[PDB]
Amino acid sequence: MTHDNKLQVEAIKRGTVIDHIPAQIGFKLLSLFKLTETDQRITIGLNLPSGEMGRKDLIKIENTFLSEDQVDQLALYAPQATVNRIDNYEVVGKSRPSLPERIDNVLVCPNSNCISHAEPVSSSFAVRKRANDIALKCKYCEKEFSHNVVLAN
């Protein structure tokens, strides 16, 4: 055995960790991405001290990695959040959430007449960045809204 402590408050090991999550956005990610459906250990901390003047959420989930087309999926919710792979810093590029070309399974089409609502299909929206806005086009009805619309309803 080489692991070395009994820490129930803040530890480390072969696991991914998302950094600098805005307040009230940490639990959102846990739900939206069912990050607790794991069997692997998970350590989260919310509303904790930030960059010397705010509040933030923190998610540490052991024995599991994230990919490129996944970390990115955090872009729309946790933009300036960093993701340090932690098998022991075997991270390479400055891993920061960029805007994915498509966002599936989480968003809900604002269009009430959209076929996606009463059917066994996954939501799917195309992403386009706008000045002061973000356009999401539904794969199904082909209607385009702003993320501000899609995140309220």
């Binding site: 604002p110 269009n111 009430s112 209607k143 702003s146 309220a152």
Partner: protein, 310 residues
């Protein structure tokens, strides 16, 4: 005796400033001291050619609170209605021989005014005629503003929602424009903006008005926040949702509101006012609806009883 005795109540525009004051004064008096036998031996017809349960029950309750009797029909496709044969004229010429007053709701604009030419000294009260008039709705609105703000002049009025088709706001705007120093704030999606003919009227009288995109732009100065219903059918589903933004109201939005502000709504508020608003002291749409009994009791009292009450 009184100015409105035996008169037809068809359009809010046929009502002079004094008429509005008289109706409102009477409404307050009946509210403070009920007169359950005032219309004791009167028989009134509640003719809803077009079904309208809420305003119908409001109108009928008013009748009973004054002691009058009621006959009628919400011929919403459930009466031996003139099989698209018998004219409204003939219907009225018959009904006007049975009762002492006719309260009617109709799908076509002008119905109540037409009834007026066939009724016999029998007064007709318009309960709504298509997209034209709804006199008593403006009266309860005016009455509710007066009671809550203590006056109808020098107020800051915001109107949110469908200003293009919500004829209740057209009437309420024209009624409040009969009072001095009122300030208006119009908040609506560009596809449902206030009609230019309304703005023309306000400019003609030097009344101050302006357009805004969100309620939080004016929440600070508003005395009355009149919320309008927006029927999705007026736009396409994707369009509605897109604009839906903030044109809906929720408790968090009232953080900087004036202590005296009241939020009003004709009803059918399902899609505009979140229920977490109901608890705030600003919510006054249910009280507003409750004032319909008084404003409509007042009209019936004035038109059917020569002498003033209280």
């Amino acid at each position: 005796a009184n100015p409105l005795y035996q008169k037809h109540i068809i359009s809010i525009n046929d009502l002079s400033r004094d008429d509005l004051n008289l109706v409102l004064a009477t409404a307050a008096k009946l509210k403070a001291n009920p007169q359950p036998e005032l219309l004791k031996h009167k028989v009134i017809a509640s003719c809803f050619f077009e079904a309208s349960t809420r305003t119908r029950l409001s109108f009928e309750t008013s009748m009973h609170r004054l002691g009058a009797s009621v006959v009628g029909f919400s011929d919403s496709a459930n009466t031996s209605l003139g099989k698209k044969g018998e004219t409204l004229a003939d219907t009225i010429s018959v009904i006007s021989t049975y009762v002492d007053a006719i309260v009617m709701r109709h799908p076509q604009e002008g119905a109540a005014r037409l009834a007026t030419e066939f009724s016999g000294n029998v007064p007709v009260l318009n309960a709504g005629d298509g997209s034209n008039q709804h006199p008593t709705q403006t009266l309860l609105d005016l009455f509710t503003i007066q009671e809550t703000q203590g006056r109808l002049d020098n107020l800051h009025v915001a109107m949110v929602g469908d200003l293009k088709y919500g004829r209740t706001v057209h009437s309420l705007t024209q009624a409040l424009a009969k009072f001095d120093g009122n300030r208006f704030y119009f908040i609506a999606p560009d596809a449902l903006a206030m009609p230019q003919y309304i703005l023309d009227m306000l400019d003609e009288k030097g009344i101050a008005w302006s357009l805004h995109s969100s309620i939080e732009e004016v929440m600070a100065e508003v005395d009355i926040l009149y919320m309008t219903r927006v029927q999705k059918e007026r736009l396409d589903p994707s369009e509605y949702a897109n604009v839906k933004a903030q044109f809906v109201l929720r408790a968090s939005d009232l953080h900087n509101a004036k202590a005296n502000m009241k939020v009003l709504h004709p009803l059918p508020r399902v899609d505009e006012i979140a229920t977490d608003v109901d608890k705030t002291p600003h919510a006054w749409y249910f009280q507003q609806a409750g004032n319909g009994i008084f404003a409509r009791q007042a009209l019936l009292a004035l038109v059917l009883n020569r002498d003033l009450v209280l």
